[PDB]
Amino acid sequence: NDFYCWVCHREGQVLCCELCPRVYHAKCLRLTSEPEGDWFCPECEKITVAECIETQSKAMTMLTIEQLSYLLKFAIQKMKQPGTDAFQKPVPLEQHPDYAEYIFHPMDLCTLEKNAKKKMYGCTEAFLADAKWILHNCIIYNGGNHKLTQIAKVVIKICEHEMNEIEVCPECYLAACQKRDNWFCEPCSNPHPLVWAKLKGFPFWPAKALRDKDGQVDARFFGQHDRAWVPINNCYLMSKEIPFSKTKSIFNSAMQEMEVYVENIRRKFGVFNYSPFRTPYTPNSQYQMLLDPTNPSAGTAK
Amino acid sequence: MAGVSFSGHRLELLAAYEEVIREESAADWALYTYEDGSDDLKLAASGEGGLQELSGHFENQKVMYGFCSVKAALPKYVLINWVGEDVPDARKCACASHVAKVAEFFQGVDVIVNASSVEDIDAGAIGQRL
Ligand SMILES: [Zn+2]
Ligand SMILES: [Zn+2]
Ligand SMILES: [Zn+2]
């Protein structure tokens, strides 16, 4: 087991996880009572939940461990930004002979890579938790205000970001990693409804509704291809007439790209139903995939 | 971290870029940078005079992105990935992961050129690259 706390990276009396090497201060878990018997730490428990078939994420249901490993390889590549040389290969004892005296569990991006390849991450949380060893160990051996520690903070933040992308949509993620011909125009297996998204001070814009949380929808914009939250309450299902009216040229480009997407959805699933003017987007909307918009009881495309 | 953001100021960013793409508009460069203490991109400046003029607006304390149109036939598009010599290494590292997303935002980038002094911005060398 590790001697330094997983949260504050300092020593002192700690609780020792029974599955993994990590250790925690009670104060740092904000414990309110003492654990009774064998103790599993928050990282182990999070992973246990995320990898249980009855409670896995929507991204994990649709991925096998091998597919997810491929996505993880892409994420490792995004973590090796220029400037990250100190973390790409295990620290040599020739450069730091005392290293093993402080770091109970070494970790580097190359090891992350090989482990991902050996298909030993069952979920994105497993992966980010393993990645954080790099930062933890950096803080222990170089100190929290070190320059290298600043870099390790960047790579753990890129890691968080990519894990989140994979979890929002694996298929989106893979298509954006490969960047094939018109990659943005490929429908996903559960196709995101197309909407007019609206940001302050910007016209209505064609977008993929990727998800809803607390009155917002996470729109991935045609043309520009970034993602941003927009209020549910001024969001409308894609239509032939625009909700209002600017910056014409790039808009026409985005429209063309959306129309290619519509054609692809029609070939993949057989339908795409445009909405009447200013039809408010609802969460988990299905109108666009209805076999007969007149008659919802017929169901949607499989 | 969400990373580079194009939400706040979106209209200004795309208005400058659209000016650069338009053949009729005189402007052939736009210059973007981050807002202080934030990952949201903002328009810093824009104008005519191509690479020669644009190299005059780069700041040594900032990460900036230069989108310049370069022409006798159809124009090609250069994105200058500027990192000032006085930008901290950690922020160079974080911003490095934004470049691709910026190129994706300003559709049609033909070449990306990394730069930290004006001397990295040679109109000839860039031209031969295209
Ligand atoms: Zn602690
Ligand atoms: Zn554990
Ligand atoms: Zn998707």
Domains along chain B with CATH numbers = 2-130 (3.40.20.10)
Looking at the DSSP assignment, which residues form a beta bridge with residue A180?
none
Beta strands in A23-142 (DSSP E): 23-24
Annotated binding-site residue? A169: yes
Radius of gyration of chain B (CA): 14
> What is the Cα–Cα distance from B4 to B98, expressed in whole angstroms?
6
Å resolution of this model?
A: 2.7
Interatomic CA distance for residues A102 and A14, integer angstroms: 16
Of the candidates A163, A101, A169, the one whose C-alpha atom is nearest the C-alpha of residue A132 is A163
Distance CA(A109)–CA(A67), nearest Å, equals: 19
**DSSP characters over A209-251:** EEEEETTEEEEEETTT--EEEEEGGG-EE-BSS-S----HHHH
Partners of B105 on chain A (C-beta within 8 Å) are 224-226
* Nearest beta carbon to residue B94 from set A154, A225, A253: A154
Does the CB of B23 have a partner CB in chain A at under 8 Å? no
Give dist(CA A177, CA A171) in Å, integer. 10
What residues contact A76, with CB distance under 8 A and at least 6 apart? Answer: A109, A112, A113, A116
- Count the Cβ atoms, other than its own, within 10 Å of residue B111: 14
What is the C-alpha to C-alpha distance for residues B26 and A162, in angstroms, rounded to an integer?
40
| Residue A236, beta-bridge partner list | A196, A280
> How many angstroms is it from A16 CA to the middle of ligand 1?
12
Distance CA A86, CA A26 (A): 32
- Buried b / exposed e along A126-142 (16+ C-beta atoms within 10 A): bbbbbbbbbbbbbbbbe
Structure tokens at A183: 């990659």
Task: State how far the Cα of A132 lies from the Cα of A107, in Å rounded to an integer.
Answer: 9
Compute the Cα dihedral for B106, B113, B120, A77 and give only its sign: positive
Q: Does A249 touch chain B (CB under 8 A)?
A: yes
Method used for this model?
X-ray
Q: SS3 for A73?
A: helix
Helices (H) and strands (E) in chain B, counts: 5, 5
B17: Cβ–Cβ under 8 A, 6 or more apart, which residues? A250, B30, B67, B106
**CA–CA gap between residue A197 and residue A238 (Å, rounded):** 9
Domain residue limits, chain A: 1-179, 180-302
A250 interfaces chain B, CB cutoff of 8 Å: yes
The continuous run of DSSP H or E covering B65 comes out as strand B63-70
Ligand 1 center to residue A111 CA distance, Å? 26
Q: Are A198 and A217 in contact (CB under 8 A)?
A: no
Give the DSSP H/E element, type plus range, for residue B120.
none
Q: Residue A2: phi, psi to the nearest 5?
A: -60, 150
Phi, psi of A54 (to 5 degrees): -75, -15
